Amino acid sequence: MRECISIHVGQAGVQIGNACWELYCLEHGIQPDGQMPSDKTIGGGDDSFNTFFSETGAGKHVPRAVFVDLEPTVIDEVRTGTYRQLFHPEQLITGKEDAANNYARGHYTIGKEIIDLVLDRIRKLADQCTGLQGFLVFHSFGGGTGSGFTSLLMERLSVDYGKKSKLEFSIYPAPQVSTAVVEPYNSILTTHTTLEHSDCAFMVDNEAIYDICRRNLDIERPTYTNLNRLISQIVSSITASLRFDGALNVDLTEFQTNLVPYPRIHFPLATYAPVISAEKAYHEQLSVAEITNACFEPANQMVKCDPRHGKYMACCLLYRGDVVPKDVNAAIATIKTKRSIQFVDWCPTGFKVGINYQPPTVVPGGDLAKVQRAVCMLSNTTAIAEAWARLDHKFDLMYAKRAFVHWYVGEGMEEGEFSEAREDMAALEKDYEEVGVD
């Protein structure tokens, strides 16, 4: 058994972390007080769920998680929430004032003053791991903390934990729910600085989640709570292999090995189905073929783009619920004859499939209906480069006038880091072109 430490940075990272651990407790049968009746080894053990939960002699199951925000209002929710009893003070880290949506303020000005405290709290969790796998890092692209402090943390983690793997869950900025106008700056700066320190990053575009919530959950004006409970479902299906018995993606390394043949191109596209409104009492239950087919609908992707006009490097199907291999292969055979699914010439045209018999868990009283089977597809397609191109274009429009740049320089950042970061994204865009275009 090898442990995984989750790190949640900034408002988005913290609030999504809160939703994920709520869902983990529902999935593993852990009550809000940390007790787990089904766990017969009191105060210890090396079960699959122990990869995410440690144990006290009193029988409490404690998340292997650290929460970090530069202002205390979001993390205080954790402290006074339903699952407050789960964590202890050492795991919650709040500062006095935030990065004001300013990458440079989160990375340089405030990051320098808090990084050693964060590492020390991380070191304490690591010291309880007999075989630490690595870290899962949740954060937004657009916030000053999520962008600026994360990138500093990732650099220091590569130093303090050279051999360990690091995975990201990153919230890509969407104007429909976005606060700041400088988020394209923060996104590019943090991607540039974090690129060589991340083994595999799952981008979630708030635009896509927002649209899924409006279209499938019939929520007129989705809130962060709506968005985060849907995101937590996707995160859960992605980390389930680390927390349950299985043979696919049982180690953080397996994510890189199965999804990332080229280190820089480490942003798999996630697609999830089915998303069904809980307000609908009766809903026709979708088959293996139908939910699998839905993995090739852009409307169900975590980032809106057209995989028909890209190339696949790797493709994983993660099913939860009443699924058997026979149905998966029958569905795949049909979908291949009907869909545009072109792999790069130097990769096998195939799918790694994992099935977990326990159906998805849904928060009681939430917006998602209980389904008998669901699937999350992780596909590394060049089509996700469309999301880099959009971001890079917004960056270019503002930077050509140096709009807002004085805010970053005023925190000690040099103007050259902008163009340096932008040139990195240009190379990234060219890497995707060279891999997926004829």
């Binding site: 440079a104 340089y108 000005t109 990051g111 320098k112 500093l152 650099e155 220091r156 590569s158 130093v159 050279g162 060589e196 320190h197 349950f244 018995d245 299985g246 043979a247 696919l248 291999p325 998966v328 292969n329 795949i332 055979a333 291949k336 792999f343 010439d345 130097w346 990769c347 096998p348 045209t349 195939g350 799918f351 790694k352 499939v353 994992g354 099935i355 977990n356 018999y357 326990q358 005023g410 925190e411 000690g412 950042m413 040099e414």
Partner: protein
């Protein structure tokens, strides 16, 4: 289209389906950059305070 590496456990199973075959900065360097940015902030504040003293 063949299936391979079928692993079964009580909680589920996993396998692979093949349709067609194919054809870091140091700690000192980080502290350097952080202190460089802090010094640039200090220089700019010193200019402000000098301007205000004038």
């Amino acid at each position: 289209m063949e299936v391979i590496e079928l692993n079964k456990c009580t909680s589920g199973q996993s396998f692979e389906v093949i349709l067609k075959p194919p054809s870091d900065p140091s700690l000192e360097e980080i502290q350097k950059k952080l202190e460089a940015a802090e010094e640039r902030r200090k220089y700019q504040e010193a200019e402000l305070l000098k301007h205000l003293a004038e």
